[PDB]
Design an enzyme around this catalytic site. Structure first.
Site, short mmCIF file in Angstrom:
data_model
loop_
_atom_site.label_atom_id
_atom_site.label_comp_id
_atom_site.label_asym_id
_atom_site.label_seq_id
_atom_site.Cartn_x
_atom_site.Cartn_y
_atom_site.Cartn_z
N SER A 196 0.85 -1.19 0.00
CA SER A 196 0.00 0.00 0.00
C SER A 196 0.89 1.24 0.00
O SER A 196 1.71 1.40 -0.91
CB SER A 196 -0.92 -0.03 1.22
OG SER A 196 -2.15 0.64 0.97
N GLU A 323 -8.88 -5.94 -4.05
CA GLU A 323 -8.37 -4.74 -3.41
C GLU A 323 -9.46 -3.78 -2.84
O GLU A 323 -9.29 -3.23 -1.73
CB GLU A 323 -7.46 -3.96 -4.40
CG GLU A 323 -6.19 -4.77 -4.81
CD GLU A 323 -5.14 -4.70 -3.72
OE1 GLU A 323 -5.43 -4.15 -2.64
OE2 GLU A 323 -4.02 -5.19 -3.91
N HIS A 436 -7.58 -6.43 0.26
CA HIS A 436 -6.39 -5.64 0.44
C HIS A 436 -5.79 -5.95 1.82
O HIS A 436 -6.53 -5.96 2.84
CB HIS A 436 -6.83 -4.17 0.39
CG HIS A 436 -5.71 -3.19 0.57
ND1 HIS A 436 -4.77 -2.96 -0.41
CD2 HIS A 436 -5.40 -2.36 1.59
CE1 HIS A 436 -3.91 -2.05 0.02
NE2 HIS A 436 -4.28 -1.66 1.22
P1 LIG Z 1 -2.68 1.82 2.00
O1 LIG Z 1 -1.52 2.50 2.61
O2 LIG Z 1 -3.59 1.03 3.01
C1 LIG Z 1 -3.09 0.40 4.20
C2 LIG Z 1 -2.94 -1.12 3.99
N1 LIG Z 1 -3.73 2.81 0.97
C3 LIG Z 1 -5.10 2.71 1.45
C4 LIG Z 1 -5.08 2.51 3.02
C5 LIG Z 1 -3.36 4.21 0.86
C6 LIG Z 1 -4.60 5.06 0.62
#
Ligand SMILES: *[P@](=O)(OCC)N(CC)CC
Ligand SMILES: *[C@@H]1O[C@H](CO[C@H]2O[C@@H](C)[C@@H](O)[C@@H](O)[C@@H]2O)[C@@H](O[C@@H]2O[C@H](CO)[C@@H](O)[C@H](O)[C@H]2NC(C)=O)[C@H](O)[C@H]1NC(C)=O
Ligand SMILES: *[C@@H]1O[C@H](CO[C@H]2O[C@@H](C)[C@@H](O)[C@@H](O)[C@@H]2O)[C@@H](O[C@@H]2O[C@H](CO)[C@@H](O)[C@H](O)[C@H]2NC(C)=O)[C@H](O)[C@H]1NC(C)=O
Ligand SMILES: *[C@@H]1O[C@H](CO[C@H]2O[C@@H](C)[C@@H](O)[C@@H](O)[C@@H]2O)[C@@H](O)[C@H](O)[C@H]1NC(C)=O
Ligand SMILES: *[C@@H]1O[C@H](CO)[C@@H](O)[C@H](O)[C@H]1NC(C)=O
Ligand SMILES: *[C@@H]1O[C@H](CO)[C@@H](O)[C@H](O)[C@H]1NC(C)=O
Ligand SMILES: *[C@@H]1O[C@H](CO)[C@@H](O)[C@H](O)[C@H]1NC(C)=O
Ligand SMILES: [Cl-]
Ligand SMILES: [Cl-]
Ligand SMILES: [Cl-]
Ligand SMILES: [Cl-]
Ligand SMILES: [Cl-]
Ligand code: NA
Length: 527
Positions: A196, A323, A436
């Site tokens: 992420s 996701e 996700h």
């Molecule tokens: P990632 O950093 O999500 C955390 C697993 N992503 C959505 C949270 C960035 C918007």
């Protein structure tokens, strides 16, 4: 008793029993001056000798951050929340090593996600001891500042230049360059990996001249810097810095006076106002993230990517089958983790409003047009499935594929995975599918622990992923060469072969989401 001498002082670690063998863990080594007081919002400052045996025997403080309180008591969300004290004094890192101490081990450096607003290296799903035990690599992970404290920007002003948390990650890679030989590591074989916002961070180190010499190779799990949530514009950044000032009563005329005011604010007041620096927002909002600062990041990164201006090396890039689903229960009308979430056409349309704030009406319609041409109109789960696909395709899958493609065009080997296995232990509902975040525990080897209630097929899937990830780090090639495994082809523009990861049979496929990504990638950026 295991004491290792670093450039800055001796550190004591602790011994762990893992699968009838031993790993040494040095948890909570400092890698920079605490960024307190006058150092708040500045780049990390290097650390000076202690002398002195630093006991690296427990995880350190996580950095200041707001917490997810949508599902109190629910392990599905709460497993992602910090599990050590929050503190500005959070600039620490962990190292796991094989026992006996290795001679010249390949190093894996993990960078966590969290939207750049949250996250910490001490989560149980990031614990590097299984990898060190099983593959004999060194695993290193670091805490880095997030939210405004990590990414506040008043462009060009060293009092608050932007990207401080990216600079924290970077000063940690420097620490590994200088110090990892002492632990038995090879500073010439270092692979960055992240999920992420951690993956987007890995992708930006590919772009940063200051990072070029601090690592060898890169792995990006569900994230790349071209994702629509990953870079804040200079205009947005200022508006938001000033909105924070307004909300904390720190508005001024002298910008350096603004920052001076913000450094007197208590960490909590800053955290509590972060969420409103923006008028509309979404469950994928990154209020305070990376910016083009003319330092870490010298130009708009899309330009760098397009024109071949990045580190030339191999990459491993992947995404999960579903996701977008996790995000639907953070505000899409009709959604709930406690039922099957059969929403209607009108609710679908309302959902687009949540996730595409403004976003013209024609834009939203075009999304609706592309995703709702049913085959056929019968299927009651139709609109529910379409909304998560919209979300994961736009935010993760299409930017990852487009990244991999443009990167590969400059000559380097690249390997793409599509992760399609849903954990037997998932506490989220079946409709959310292969979510996700949920490949991470397979990559870190949690399912190798039999005591733990994963199935046999899962242990096997994990053991294989661990091998491929390790062979990538050591040799630039994510093959599992011993067990008649399917061979993993390089991803080339033209063919775009990718490997599926699941418990039954892994396949070589081509052109993932070709029809969907044509929409997101060529058409939508226009609206
Ligand atoms: P990632 O950093 O999500 C955390 C697993 N992503 C959505 C949270 C960035 C918007
Ligand atoms: C830049 O910010 C302005 C507004 O500034 C903000 O003040 C903050 C304290 C915050 O609470 C926020 O709500 C407020 O907007 C944004 O324009 C705003 O949009 C609506 C219009 O209906 C109003 O509620 C705001 O007051 C209005 N601006 C004002 C107050 O003049 C604007 O969107 C933003 N620009 C961007 C996105 O770069
Ligand atoms: C699945 O649940 C959603 C989410 O909201 C509900 O959660 C349920 C488990 C239940 O406790 C309910 O009281 C709670 O609010 C339902 O969405 C809601 O639908 C109701 C219908 O009565 C509306 O009044 C609500 O506005 C709406 N919630 C919102 C604002 O999102 C949903 O209907 C339910 N769907 C099913 C059963 O398939
Ligand atoms: C450790 O190996 C160093 C060379 O590392 C290379 O070989 C592989 C590890 C691979 O990842 C390549 O990318 C690297 O170029 C060597 O120069 C050192 O002297 C060695 N140090 C020791 C054994 O102490
Ligand atoms: C560090 O740990 C060692 C061994 O357990 C202990 O003996 C020493 O006093 C410690 N130093 C401290 C507590 O700061
Ligand atoms: C703004 O005020 C700061 C506070 O010390 C000062 O250093 C700076 O010179 C001022 N900027 C200008 C030139 O307006
Ligand atoms: C190879 O297969 C054996 C069983 O035949 C298994 O125990 C081992 O975990 C496998 N190795 C890898 C790297 O998958
Ligand atoms: Cl878990
Ligand atoms: Cl049908
Ligand atoms: Cl296979
Ligand atoms: Cl597809
Ligand atoms: Cl099209
Ligand atoms: Na169109």
């Amino acid at each position: 008793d295991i004491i290792i001498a670093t450039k800055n002082g001796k550190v004591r670690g602790m011994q762990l029993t893992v699968f009838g063998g031993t790993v040494t863990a040095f948890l909570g080594i400092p890698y920079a001056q605490p960024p307190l007081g006058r150092l708040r919002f500045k780049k990390p400052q290097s650390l000076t000798k202690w002398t002195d045996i630093w006991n690296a025997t427990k995880y350190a403080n996580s950095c200041c951050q707001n917490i997810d309180q949508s599902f109190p008591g629910f392990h599905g969300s709460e497993m992602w929340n910090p599990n050590t004290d929050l503190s500005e004094d959070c600039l620490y890192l962990n190292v796991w090593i094989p026992a006996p101490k290795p001679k010249n081990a390949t190093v894996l450096i993990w960078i966590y996600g969290g939207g750049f607003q949250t996250g910490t290296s001490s989560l149980h799903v990031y614990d590097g001891k299984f990898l060190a035990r099983v593959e004999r690599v060194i695993v290193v992970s670091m805490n880095y500042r997030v939210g405004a404290l990590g990414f506040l920007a008043l462009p060009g002003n060293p009092e608050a230049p932007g990207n401080m948390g990216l600079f924290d990650q970077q000063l940690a890679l420097q620490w590994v360059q200088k110090n990892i030989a002492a632990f038995g590591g090879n500073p010439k074989s270092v692979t960055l990996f992240g999920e992420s916002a951690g993956a987007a961070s890995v992708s930006l180190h590919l772009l940063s001249p200051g990072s070029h010499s601090l690592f060898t190779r890169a792995i990006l799990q569900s994230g790349s810097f071209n994702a629509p949530w990953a870079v804040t514009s200079l205009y947005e950044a200022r508006n938001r810095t000033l909105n924070l000032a307004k909300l904390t009563g720190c508005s001024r005329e002298n910008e350096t006076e603004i920052i001076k005011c913000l450094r007197n604010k208590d960490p909590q007041e800053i955290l509590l106002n972060e969420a409103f620096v923006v008028p509309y927002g979404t469950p994928l909002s990154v209020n305070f993230g990376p910016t083009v600062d003319g330092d870490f990041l010298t130009d708009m990164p899309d330009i760098l990517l397009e024109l071949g201006q990045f580190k030339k090396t191999q990459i491993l890039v992947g995404v999960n089958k579903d996701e977008g689903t996790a995000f639907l229960v953070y505000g899409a009308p009709g959604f709930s983790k406690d039922n099957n979430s059969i929403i209607t056409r009108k609710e679908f349309q309302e959902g687009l409003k949540i996730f595409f704030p403004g976003v013209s009406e024609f834009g939203k319609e075009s999304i609706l047009f592309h995703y709702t041409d049913w085959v056929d109109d019968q299927r009651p789960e139709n609109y529910r499935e379409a909304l998560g696909d919209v979300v994961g395709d736009y935010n993760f899958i299409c930017p990852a594929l487009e990244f991999t493609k443009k990167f590969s065009e400059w000559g380097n080997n690249a390997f793409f995975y599509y992760f399609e296995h849903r954990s037997s232990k998932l506490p989220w509902p079946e409709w959310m599918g292969v979510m996700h975040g949920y490949e991470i525990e397979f990559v870190f080897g949690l399912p190798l622990e039999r005591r733990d209630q994963y199935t046999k097929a899962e242990e096997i899937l994990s053991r294989s992923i661990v091998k491929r990830w390790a062979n990538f780090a050591k040799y630039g090639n994510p093959q599992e060469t011993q067990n008649n495994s399917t061979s993993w082809p390089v991803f080339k523009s033209t063919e775009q072969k990718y490997l599926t990861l699941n418990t039954e049979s892994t396949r070589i496929m081509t052109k993932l989401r070709a029809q969907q990504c044509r929409f997101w990638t060529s058409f939508f950026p226009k609206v």
